[PDB]
Amino acid sequence: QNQRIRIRLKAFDHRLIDQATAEIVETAKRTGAQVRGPIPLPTRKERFTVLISPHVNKDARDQYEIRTHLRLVDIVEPTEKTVDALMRLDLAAGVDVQISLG
Amino acid sequence: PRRRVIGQRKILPDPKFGSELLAKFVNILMVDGKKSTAESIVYSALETLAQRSGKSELEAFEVALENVRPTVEVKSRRVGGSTYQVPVEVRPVRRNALAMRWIVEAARKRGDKSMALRLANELSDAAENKGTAVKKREDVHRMAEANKAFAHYRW
Amino acid sequence: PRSLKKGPFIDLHLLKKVEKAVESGDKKPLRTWSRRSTIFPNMIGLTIAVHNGRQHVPVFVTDEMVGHKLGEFAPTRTYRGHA
Amino acid sequence: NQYYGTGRRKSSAARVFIKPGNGKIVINQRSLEQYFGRETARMVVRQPLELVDMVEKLDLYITVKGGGISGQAGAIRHGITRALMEYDESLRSELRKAGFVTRDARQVERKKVGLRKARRRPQFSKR
Amino acid sequence: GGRVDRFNKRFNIP
Amino acid sequence: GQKVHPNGIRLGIVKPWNSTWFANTKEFADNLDSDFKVRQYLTKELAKASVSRIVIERPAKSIRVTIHTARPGIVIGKKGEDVEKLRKVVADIAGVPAQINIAEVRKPELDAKLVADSITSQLERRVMFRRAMKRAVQNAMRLGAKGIKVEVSGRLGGAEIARTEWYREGRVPLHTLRADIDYNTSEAHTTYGVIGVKVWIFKGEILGGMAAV
Amino acid sequence: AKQSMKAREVKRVALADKYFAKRAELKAIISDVNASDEDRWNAVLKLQTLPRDSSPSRQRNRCRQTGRPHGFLRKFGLSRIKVREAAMRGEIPGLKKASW
RNA sequence: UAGCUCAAGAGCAGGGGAUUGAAAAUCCCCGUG
RNA sequence: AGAACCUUACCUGGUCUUGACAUCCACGGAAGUUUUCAGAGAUGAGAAUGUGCCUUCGGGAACCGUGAGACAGGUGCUGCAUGGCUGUCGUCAGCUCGUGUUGUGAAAUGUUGGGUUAAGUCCCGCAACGAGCGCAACCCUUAUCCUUUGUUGCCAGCGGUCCGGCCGGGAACUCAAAGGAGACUGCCAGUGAUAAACUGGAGGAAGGUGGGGAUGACGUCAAGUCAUCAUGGCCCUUACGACCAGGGCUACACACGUGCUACAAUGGCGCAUACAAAGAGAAGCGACCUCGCGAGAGCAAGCGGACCUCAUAAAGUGCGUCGUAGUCCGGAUUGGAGUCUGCAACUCGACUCCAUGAAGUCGGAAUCGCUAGUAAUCGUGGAUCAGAAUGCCACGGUGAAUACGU
Ligand SMILES: [Mg+2]
Ligand SMILES: [Mg+2]
Ligand SMILES: [Mg+2]
Ligand SMILES: [Mg+2]
Ligand SMILES: [Mg+2]
Ligand SMILES: [Mg+2]
Ligand SMILES: [Mg+2]
Ligand SMILES: [Mg+2]
Ligand SMILES: [Mg+2]
Predict the structure, then answer these.
(1) Pairing of strands A61-75, A39-40
(2) Which segments of the protein form a coiled coil according to its record (chain D)?
């Protein structure tokens, strides 16, 4: 749209990402930017099964999972200061961010 | 069943006549969970039976069961050293089950182009007290009449 | 089988050998440790010692063998009977 | 006005909007007879109606997604049940006794390691 | 026959 | 063929992971092997430095690595030249710059990792296995541990026959994930076979602590 | 697997990497229709000469620590037991017990 | 007199399948001139 | 959780030796490139080419190659040397200890007796009193409500619309992922030693442990694994080490184990046609459109993914469809002919096509699972993976019968 940027946060925890989410939303509102709510998207759960035994006995299998949390926030008004602020802003190492305007 | 007392599961009545008896019948006849084909065969078989003998579907169906339904069976009780075949009266609910069961068994045995054709003739013969299904009732009663002497210790 | 769009596959070592053989009329067996190649019209009438795993079986290429591979004419297992 | 209810049977979620009219139960724009086939399905959806007074005096707007005939049909029935209770707060008695207010919690059991299905186990050999 | 005739037409013969 | 690893079962609730770097299905594979190699290297160079948990975080284009030790002064050194050289050598193995923290290990006795390392050093020096266990147990109990359970397995005493003694004092629950039991493992490479060591230190339930703070 | 087998594996991938560009273009000529018949045949012969190893089908997935040729997993790399080991001690970022 | 032991029958013995922690025993099925 | 070569440890054909990998010093060459040819390939000749980087201006990090040494090397040996992981009894309710007491003593007691419970679960009892690993709970997932949040998800109330949530609009609802709430034997009554417990009943989405999954006590079997690895000792070491070309690991007079598919008219095809979940995907998924029996192919959008893609759900229904036949059942097997994967498809791949159309008409003795969304059923997905699933793992759809009882 009018240069609007959508920010996608990707992590592996249900807390870290929410904690980091507050920072990325509170900042924009503080500087006076309308940031869309931290919409929750389905947490992809990849499921793996592995033989737990070095040899025979193929019933002793284990079930693993990876929960990838992905929150998304939209800022309709791309004010220069806020955009530049979010850029320089450093976020928790645990979470990852894909900054794309489109 | 060692300790767990079991109640009774409620079954939905059949869509057409609203009969609990017939809903159980299609369940026993059903194979591979294919209900839709089961009642279609049964309903068409009932239409043939009703037209071939005049009587209403529901009244005709009940008469066939009444003429095949057994009243006494032989249980297997390990009395003392060696087990004997103890005759035992059968509860009314179980009566319905065995009657319907024999019908389906006898149907599959008989040779006919369509099982619908089978069911119809099968019920018709049962109402006349003839056919394979009713033959079991005398055989079951003969087993329970020849062994009627062992009727003082049951389980 | 192999795709028709790719044509026939032949080993260059064997391929080089047959070229020399045809231009000189050689009759000595062709020593080859390979079997993946296919029968070409230019090998007709030659004798090739095809490896089977331990030894080289001499096979005389004939007219009817055109289009087949060297592998179909070199049995790899020695089987007489179970009794 | 609008009366809302939520139904769920296996994996289907049904949204029911109740407003008076001439019945004509619409299920995902399509008509009743069109959406449902097997006679049993249509009978169960209409069970609460006959059970109460408004058998067809009012109308039923239905949107359903996911699952199959059973799930969808059962969830529609369940939604109607809750919505009628919200409308009258008096149908509980008959509905509760008819086991309609209870949410059917039976779901497909997950597959387990070492078994081919929920409970079926590979054929066993004693010796 | 054909063993060679087939080979001839099927393959481009480069 | 029984008893699961108490750390793993509690890796989401209670116990935290030792690596919290998000990634995808591409870079992830590589990162793992580099983490593997660096940890083994560091453990060899500081097996005598009472290292306990070499936490490794991979921030955006960074690899912050932490080290829990009970002798930080030994590790650092006068003006810490030793720490500085470690950073350089570890960073080249996987590229990218590196920042090193030293999370000092207060009361080393309560850390099962440290205790098992000490016990195994004794066994290499041929110290009466029975003595070692009693010492470690008493040390933890006096320093404050709701429970301790230490297990020893292998060709103890030198004989060719196996053996698995274990001493336990206090509550050492393992079916309550609301606990905080640490279970390190150690492979003492004694002359005869490879005596193994596993220790559970029930430091105390994290009921109030919930999952994280 | 032995250390030697791991050494042979890394040699296979290294050789394929060096000739990766040549193989990609050479097969493109083969695959592409309308190309001269003689050109396609020469391309086939060139691939033969081209070291076998260079083919990406000559690599067997092995554990990056032990080299086990069986039980490999693309995701998480490692191997069967190796995954567990890292995940069990708390080195894999996110894995845990599944109770769905 | 079927490989024995008697009448090309039967049985015994043969094989296979059962049953045996496991083998005889036993059960079945078949080949038995 | 996947032998065409790879793998492979096997055979066999040919190479080779401080060795492929491993250091250590000197040594030579930057490394490296491009090509030629010997040859099955290993290995072996040839060339041309560059000849660096780093301080420093020598020589160094390198690297490639020679030699010497020490060593390297074994999927060699030993699981009755071990670690470690795993099976098992058994999710069975048990196993213990302290202290005291008793008995010469090994032991006993606690831990049992009367109740109760899924339970050494609780209650009385009581030379025991305490404790602890279990049990239970704490976890995850499902079931109803709330709040928060509206994405691409949603579309009620909106009006316009191409009738397409499409597009404005909106935040209703679905859905989602966070916080929560909620079932507690709590409540009600009954029974029971005035207990513990049980029983019914109300309420309630949900009743006794609401439904799963996770979680295996002390130990047993000198259970299995040295070929994951580590490791102890022995043995090997121009070879029991290593390279590479071909085969074998798919051999077949033979028996079993586990799957699959059929022995049909619940079918059997034809057409029409309704409804899912779960996933995966960047050298990948690949819309499309065009061609091709098909398989495919060209053509190439988009998609790192609640957006695009795989993608068709099929069981089901609508009419028609044949008449019990080895069948319009089923339909292995082959005689061929295409595509596709890949150095490479014969041994020994997979799919599409032609032609072929068996056995098999519910299977002796025997023996398996299962008691609910289970069995039975019918799809779909996914890991492994160049390609190669009736195997495994998941995910839906449909959907029973039976329990007097011990
Ligand atoms: Mg491959
Ligand atoms: Mg091979
Ligand atoms: Mg053993
Ligand atoms: Mg005592
Ligand atoms: Mg207890
Ligand atoms: Mg428990
Ligand atoms: Mg043993
Ligand atoms: Mg063994
Ligand atoms: Mg095999």
Answers:
(1) antiparallel
(2) none
Q: Helices (H) and strands (E) in chain B — how many of each?
A: 6, 2
Indicate if F35 and F115 belong to the same structural domain. no
DSSP letter for B109, please.
H
What is the crossing angle of helices B115-127 and B35-53, to 10°?
50
Partners of chain C (3+ Cβ pairs below 8 A): E, G
DSSP 8-state class, residue C69: B
Residue D127 Cβ < 7 Å to strand H: yes
Determine how β-strand D58-65 pairs with β-strand F51-53: unpaired
The amino acid at residue C34 is S
Alpha-carbon distance C75 to C82, whole Å?
18
CA distance readout (Å), A84 to A26, A95, A99, D52: 15, 20, 12, 64
Burial class (CB in 10 A: 0-12, 13-18, 19+), F76: middle
DSSP bridge pairs for B89: B72
d(CA B71, CA B140): 9
Q: Measuring CA to CA, how many Å separate A6 from each of A17, A95, B56, D34?
A: 16, 16, 71, 43
Residue F127 inside a domain? The answer is yes
d(CA F176, C1' I197) / Å = 27
Specify if B11 maps to a domain. no
Residue numbers of the domain that contains F95? 16-106
- D126: nt with nearest C1' to CA: I367
Cross-chain residue pair F8–G91, CB shorter than 8 Å: no
CA–centroid distance, residue D42 to ligand 3 (Å): 64
Q: Are C36 and C69 in contact (CB under 8 A)?
A: yes
CB F38 within 8 A of CB F94: yes
Protein G69 CA to nucleic acid I75 C1', in Å?
A: 12
Q: CA of G23: how far to CAs of C2, E14, G44, in Å?
A: 19, 22, 11
Nucleotides of H under 7 A from a protein CB: 19-22
Residue F49 shares a structural domain with residue F122:
no
Distance in Å, residue F115 CA to nucleotide I387 C1': 53
Closest by CA position to B68, among listed B132, B108, B126: B126
Total tally of structural domains belonging to chain A: 1
Residue F85 domain-assigned (yes or no): yes
The strand H neighbours among D residues 87-126, by Cβ under 7 Å, are 126
E strand spans, chain F? 51-53, 65-69, 100-102, 147-153, 166-170, 181-187, 196-202
- In three-state secondary structure terms, A39 is strand
CATH of the domain at B75: 1.10.455.10
Q: Are F5 and G88 in contact (CB under 8 A)?
A: yes
List the beta bridge partners of residue A47: A65
d(CA A18, CA A11): 10
Say whether F170 sits in a helix, a strand or coil. Answer: strand
Which residue in A has a C-alpha nearest to residue F20's C-alpha? A94
